[PDB]
Amino acid sequence: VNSFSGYLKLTDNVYIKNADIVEEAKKVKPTVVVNAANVYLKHGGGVAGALNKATNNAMQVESDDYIATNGPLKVGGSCVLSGHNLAKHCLHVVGPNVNKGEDIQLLKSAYENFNQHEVLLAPLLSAGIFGADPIHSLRVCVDTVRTNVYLAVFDKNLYDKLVSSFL
């Protein structure tokens, strides 16, 4: 038993809700919140900009130190950093950005990072400003992630299309 509420169960291990991941995060304090990161961990907009703003820019300060030490992430890769006031940990995962021409097949690799964590609060990778089809992202998610994932979908209209179209 865990503390997530109001989710619809899609599969054995994947759940979905219409929710603001920031507000969902501040209420659950999950062990892991996933950030929709880029390779530079520049949290300017989308999910990342929202999570970072909610941390009072502390996520960005920590991220800049991480990059200065380690260099950029790989597309499809991830790193674990602090969750600040939102979660114990933030898993920054780099899905491919279609608006940069990155290979959508890397989306499966991106979701594989979720399997290193037993339970996660997460957005749909490569959705939103990353330019992928969210219906496809949900499919790859269901077919790749084996751990328990609670997907927060900000847009109510999108949430309903994803549920109604889910096979």
Ligand SMILES: CCc1c[nH]c2ncnc(N3CCC[C@H](Cc4nc(C)no4)C3)c12
């Ligand atoms: C500000 C956006 C936001 C606020 N609060 C949220 N809560 C859940 N999801 C959210 N996003 C919508 C946009 C796309 C994003 C997915 C994705 N961005 C990139 C790059 N690649 O994928 C997810 C949000």
